[PDB]
Amino acid sequence: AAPANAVTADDPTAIALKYNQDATKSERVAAARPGLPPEEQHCANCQFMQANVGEGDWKGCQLFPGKLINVNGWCASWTLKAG
Numbered sequence: 680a681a682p683a684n685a686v687t688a689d690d691p692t693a694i695a696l697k698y699n700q701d702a703t704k705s706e707r708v709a710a711a712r713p714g715l716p717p718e719e720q721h722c723a724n725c726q727f728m729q730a731n732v733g734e735g736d737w738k739g740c741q742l743f744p745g746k747l748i749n750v751n752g753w754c755a756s757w758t759l760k761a762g
């Protein structure tokens with residue numbers, strides 16, 4: 680079950696970025712964002728994931744202030760975690 684502040688499918692920014700909490704139900708292949716082959720991309724290996732926000736599988740994303748994403752999710756702003 681998602682936290683009360685999870686990013687949800689109806690959030691305008693989530694729609695614009697084609698976020699999904701489950702990267703296997705995402706369009707990461709179509710987007711072909713650079714840095715890793717697409718099938719390898721999810722929030723856990725994204726630069727915008729905030730490992731010190733949230734709990735468990737539900738972590739922060741700098742693009743979704745006040746909310747939580749799933750570490751197993753994806754959106755079209757995915758960017759390799761470089762530091």
Ligand code: SF4
Pocket residue numbers: 698721722723725726727728739740741742748752753754755756757758
């Ligand atoms: S920017 Fe990165 S951490 Fe945030 S939802 Fe998109 S893929 Fe996940």
